[PDB]
């Protein structure tokens, strides 16, 4: 949207309530060096140079039927307005495909809905997952295909991982564990949200397991993932406040 120097991107926001992707453009300026790394990805400080429409970049994955024809409303326009400092995540060089960027962002959106459902029970500590978006870094040279990344708001504070996607319980806090338990029981065992991590109860990069192991990226470890969580879960006061069953 802005005149100043930066690179262009195609920005994708998933909206679970209409079950559609919203396609936009933005300009961003990313730092040359990462400020952190995880297992597969590196995180980069980025500044937004504004969000606009995708009109100049005519359009397949996601398929056309999954894309909203209208993009006037979105979180991006406020959360990524010009000046906003945020975080860009790129796969190192290592496995990643186009589909996986979208799966991962949609997954975080699904977890974000679970956070709201959890909060509606009025737990002692309310929780929230950050927005996440797919960005096609179209100014960067494509073996093909385009450079993709995901972006999300900047968390300020000490970043802590509370559980992994395979049974680790990494801190003593109760809410992140009760939340994982809550998603499992309240989904009637259709899914569980783990990899609960972020700053305080602002969370990012969660991971879902489902019994059939289908979808939800490469970190979906299916029944094994679910059972590994069960083996290590001790119900706490939040689990009890939420009236969750001590079995399962
Ligand atoms: N929104 C954020 N704000 C600030 N720091 C973050 C944010 N998201 C991730 N980080 C930091 O970047 C690291 C790597 O990100 P991560 O999502 O774990 O990548 P991977 O795909 O390898 O798991 C995290 O361990 C954390 O230290
Ligand atoms: Zn529990």
Curated annotation (Swiss-Prot):
<feature type="domain" description="Alpha-type protein kinase">
    <location>
        <begin position="13"/>
        <end position="247"/>
    </location>
</feature>
<protein>
    <recommendedName>
        <fullName>Myosin heavy chain kinase A</fullName>
    </recommendedName>
</protein>
<feature type="binding site">
    <location>
        <begin position="217"/>
        <end position="222"/>
    </location>
    <ligand>
        <name>ATP</name>
    </ligand>
</feature>
<comment type="subunit">
    <text>Oligomer.</text>
</comment>
<comment type="function">
    <text>Catalyzes its autophosphorylation, which is needed for enzymatic activity and phosphorylates myosin II heavy chain at a threonine in the C-terminal tail region. This phosphorylation is critical for regulating the assembly and disassembly of myosin II filament, affecting myosin localization during an array of cellular contractile events, including cytokinesis and capping of cell surface receptors as well as chemotactic cell locomotion.</text>
</comment>
<comment type="similarity">
    <text>Belongs to the protein kinase superfamily. Alpha-type protein kinase family. ALPK subfamily.</text>
</comment>
<feature type="region of interest" description="Catalytic">
    <location>
        <begin position="1"/>
        <end position="248"/>
    </location>
</feature>
